[PDB]
A paper describes a structure:
Among them are the ubiquitous surface proteins (Usps): A1, A2, and A2H, which all belong to the trimeric autotransporter adhesin family. They bind extracellular matrix molecules and inhibit the classical and alternative pathways of the complement cascade by recruiting complement regulators C3d and C4b binding protein. TAAs are anchored in the bacterial outer membrane by a 12-stranded β-barrel (the translocation domain) comprised of four strands from each monomer, from where the passenger domain is exposed to the extracellular environment. The passenger domain consists of an N-terminal β-strand head domain followed by the neck domain and a coiled-coil stalk.
In this study, we present the crystallographic structure of UspA1299–452, which contains the putative C3d binding site. The asymmetric unit of the crystal contained one trimer of UspA1299–452, as is typical of a trimeric autotransporter adhesin. It consists of part of the neck domain (residues 299–336) and the stalk (residues 337–452). The neck domain of UspA1299–452 is a long neck containing, towards its end, the characteristic DAVN motif that mediates the transition from the left-handed parallel β-roll headgroup to the α-helical stalk. The stalk domain is a left-handed coiled-coil built mostly from heptad repeats with the typical arrangement of repeating hydrophobic (h) amino acids separated by polar (p) residues in the seven-residue abcdefg pattern hpphppp. There are, however, two disruptions from the heptad pattern: after Gly396 and Gly442 in the d position, there is a Leu that occurs structurally at position a, instead of the canonical polar amino acid at position e to complete the abcdefg heptad pattern. In addition to Leu, there are another three amino acids (LeuAspLeu) inserted in these sites making them an 11-residue pattern. This changes the periodicity of the coiled-coil from heptad (7-residue pattern) to hendecad (11-residue pattern), which is consistent with the daTAA server predictions. The side chains of Asn347, 375, 382 and 414 in the d positions face the central core of the trimer and the amide nitrogens of their side chains coordinate chloride ions, forming characteristic N@d layers; the distances of those interactions range from 2.90 to 3.61 Å, as expected. Cl− coordinated by amide nitrogens of Asn414, in contrast to Cl− coordinated by other Asn, have only 50% occupancy, as there was strong negative (Fo-Fc) density after refinement with 100% occupancy (more details in Discussion). We performed multiple binding studies between recombinant C3d and UspA1299452, but were not able to demonstrate saturation binding; the Kd appears to be 140.5 ± 8.4 μM, which is not consistent with physiological concentrations of C3.
Author numbering:
A (entry chain C), C (entry chain B): 299 to 453
B (entry chain A): 300 to 456
Amino acid sequence: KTGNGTVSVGKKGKERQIVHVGAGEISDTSTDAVNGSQLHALATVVAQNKADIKDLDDEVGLLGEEINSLEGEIFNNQDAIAKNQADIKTLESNVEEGLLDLSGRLLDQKADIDNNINNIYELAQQQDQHSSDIKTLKNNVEEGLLDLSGRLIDL
Amino acid sequence: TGNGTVSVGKKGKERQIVHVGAGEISDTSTDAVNGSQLHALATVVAQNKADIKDLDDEVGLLGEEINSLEGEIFNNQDAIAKNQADIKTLESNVEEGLLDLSGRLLDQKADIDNNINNIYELAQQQDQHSSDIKTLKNNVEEGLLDLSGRLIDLVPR
Amino acid sequence: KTGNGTVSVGKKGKERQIVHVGAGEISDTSTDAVNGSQLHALATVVAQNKADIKDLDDEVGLLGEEINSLEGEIFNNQDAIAKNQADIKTLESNVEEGLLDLSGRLLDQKADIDNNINNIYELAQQQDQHSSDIKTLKNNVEEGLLDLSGRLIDL
Ligand SMILES: [Cl-]
Ligand SMILES: [Cl-]
Ligand SMILES: [Cl-]
Ligand SMILES: [Cl-]
Ligand SMILES: [Zn+2]
Ligand SMILES: [Zn+2]
């Protein structure tokens, strides 16, 4: 067997195929030759591993895009929340201011209701002193007129 | 075995080529290769296959995590919309409750100010009645006194 | 060499390389020997698949971290949303309590104003009667005085 470290089936630039080769053992100790059908079988797996890596890559890109979409929506939630927070605060201000000035107009109106009840009391006093001054006057015109009348009939 | 090919057998009676030393594995190698070299590669391809299947599972779990998040985000959207709507409902209840009270409070404003025009009309009509009583009692005293003074009739000196 | 199931190019421990082997047919029926550049081409693809699987594992690991950080924004939004739910119900009750209290004040002012109307009316009726009593008393003492002197010039 030619060449003493090597068995040659041609020369550089004039290579030969080796044909009618039985398939060899495929193991970590095999020193059998390998034929093309054995490389083909392996290449079929590799192709399938490659097609599968491509499908996973497409999947992983879309997952990443969905995560970014979800992030966009979390941030719209945040804005909406801040806006509700702000509208609560302005609605807080508008409640007490409005009730504050409803309460100021209640106190002004009680002040003049209290003044009106005072005047009604005072008017009611001097209205009863009048009902007496008018009946003591009425009695003393009667007494007086008929005392004078009495000194007329004395004649 | 011409000068295109070399044959170790025939169809149906192929032969294994045995005691083959490992050949150079490079992009110009014209060496035969042996079965432990193909074995070495096939082990890597097995490992890659196994690793793709682990990776697939992780991708599957990630997808389930993402849909969990989506579900919570949707719950946040709902509650936010319920808050948004309670706030408008409260804002419209507060406008109608203040305006109804400010309306009853200004119908009182007006009816009280009419009571003050009436207390002023009573107070100075009552102040004429006081001076009418005085000038009435004065003219009574003055009119009886001058009748009594018409005793001049009966005057035994 | 030939041992009828095998062709030998060496022996155990003194195996030889076959050289100047032209590329065999790669196909599922092929009985061509394969050479080193044919296995090298395939291993190149296996290396790329291995590189791709690692990159993808790294990408999938960053998305897992991304997802985790978003979880934390979601639970913060839930805190904020809950705070807002409380503040709104707290504000609802303050608004109800505040406008109920102001309503009480307005009814007790309405009470003392229609009493003021009842009393201002009563005063006016008692006051227009005084206008009655003062004018009749006037022309009743006018009538009394002028008949006493009507009779006292009868002398
Ligand atoms: Cl959210
Ligand atoms: Cl692979
Ligand atoms: Cl909210
Ligand atoms: Cl009043
Ligand atoms: Zn990508
Ligand atoms: Zn064998």
